[PDB]
Structure formats: C-alpha cells, structure tokens
Design a protein around this motif. Structure first.
Motif, PDB file in Angstrom:
ATOM      1  N   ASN A 120     -19.429   7.743   3.439  1.00  0.00           N
ATOM      2  CA  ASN A 120     -18.695   6.748   2.661  1.00  0.00           C
ATOM      3  C   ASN A 120     -17.398   6.417   3.388  1.00  0.00           C
ATOM      4  OD1 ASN A 120     -17.443   5.226   0.710  1.00  0.00           O
ATOM      5  ND2 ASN A 120     -17.325   6.868  -0.824  1.00  0.00           N
ATOM      6  N   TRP A 122     -14.908   4.804   2.382  1.00  0.00           N
ATOM      7  CA  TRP A 122     -13.755   4.908   1.496  1.00  0.00           C
ATOM      8  C   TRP A 122     -13.368   6.338   1.171  1.00  0.00           C
ATOM      9  CZ3 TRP A 122     -12.617   0.926   3.447  1.00  0.00           C
ATOM     10  CH2 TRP A 122     -13.083  -0.356   3.149  1.00  0.00           C
ATOM     11  N   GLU A 138     -18.353   2.401  -0.626  1.00  0.00           N
ATOM     12  CA  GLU A 138     -18.502   1.138   0.090  1.00  0.00           C
ATOM     13  C   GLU A 138     -19.898   0.539  -0.084  1.00  0.00           C
ATOM     14  OE1 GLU A 138     -19.918  -1.224   3.204  1.00  0.00           O
ATOM     15  OE2 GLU A 138     -20.331   0.956   3.261  1.00  0.00           O
TER      16      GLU A 138
END
Ligand SMILES: CNc1nc(F)nc2c1ncn2Cc1cccc(Cl)c1
Length: 164
Positions: A120, A122, A138
């Motif tokens: 991920n 983020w 994301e």
C-alpha cells in the motif's frame, strides 16, 4: 463473472477496517451497518461525498484474514435503530455512535497469505494487511486486493450499481 465488480470498484476509494472481535463483523454482515471511532468517522464521511464508491475491507484482529468487503451506502447517522456492538476495553457506545449503512460486496474470507504480493503506497509500501483501523488503501492496491477474494455468488451487484 467479475465485470460488474470491476465497474463498482472503478475510481473507488478503499479503507482498511480493523475490528477487535468477530462478533461485530458478524453483526455488520447481518444488519448492513458499521460504526468506527470519531476520527475515522470523519474521514469516511468526507470520502463518501468525494467518490463514486467507498469500499471498506474488513479484518478481525489476530485472525490472519480479511472477512470481506462492503460499499458505504450512506454517511454516518445517529439515533436510528440501535446496534448492540460488543465493546472492547477502551470503547464506549458513544464512540461507536455514528452508524453507516453498507452493502456487502463479498462476505467471504481471504487469508493474509494470499495478499502478500500487494503493498500500500499510503502506508509506506508495507503489505496491505498492515495498517491501523481506517488506513486508506491506494486505488490500484485496493482494486487488486478486492479482486483476490473468492467470488460471493450470493450477492447481485445490480442493485449496488444503481446506487452509484
Ligand atoms: C463496531 N466497531 C468496532 N468494533 C471493534 F470490535 N473494534 C473496532 C471497531 N472500530 C475500530 N476497532 C478497532 C479499535 C481501535 C481503537 C481502540 C479499540 Cl478498543 C479498537
């Protein structure tokens, strides 16, 4: 098939939901509702207005699995039909007071061993299983994660598509 599912996930936003117990996820599957802490409640209400679909991907702590995913059908609302959540230690009913309505897209489990190839952006590109309650995933990661779940042939996405 998976074409309607891909359509629902088009341009969606995804959030990881971490529940301390199985009972609340079972209640959510039965009643089509979820409640989170006020910090995440604010994030989800903002996301609901911003995107065609907001997807919650559920994982019970210590289970080693995701238990399914669902689409927000409303912003949080207070005072409706009450919900008897099993409250963890540092958790009050006023903390879980905002209730979102959700439509389940998949009620089947996915073990974390099957998502080990997805990271991920983020969350520092950690494996997508890693994250706190409310962590945003994301788009590309979240789409691929949802596509890994076994098909739930009990669900007809036609009614979900009309809500978009
Ligand atoms: C019905 N909603 C929920 N039910 C359960 F069981 N755990 C939840 C939850 N929302 C978030 N968590 C995780 C969490 C975060 C901080 C502190 C605690 Cl004690 C638990």
């Amino acid at each position: 098939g998976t074409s309607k599912l891909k359509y629902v996930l088009q341009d969606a936003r995804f959030f990881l939901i971490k529940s301390n117990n199985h009972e609340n996820v079972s209640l959510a599957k039965a009643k089509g509702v979820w409640s989170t802490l006020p910090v995440n409640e604010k994030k989800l209400n903002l996301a609901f207005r911003s995107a065609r679909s907001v997807i919650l991907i559920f994982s019970v702590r210590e289970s080693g699995k995701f238990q399914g995913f669902a689409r927000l059908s409303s912003e949080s609302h207070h005072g409706g039909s009450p919900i008897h959540w099993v409250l963890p230690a540092g958790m009050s009913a006023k903390m879980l007071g905002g209730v979102f309505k959700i439509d389940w897209i998949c009620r089947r489990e996915l073990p974390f061993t099957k998502s080990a190839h997805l990271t991920n952006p983020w969350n520092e590109h950690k494996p997508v299983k890693i994250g706190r309650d409310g962590q945003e995933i994301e788009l590309e990661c979240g789409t691929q994660l949802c596509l890994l779940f076994p098909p739930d042939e009990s669900i007809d996405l036609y009614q979900v598509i009309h809500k978009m």
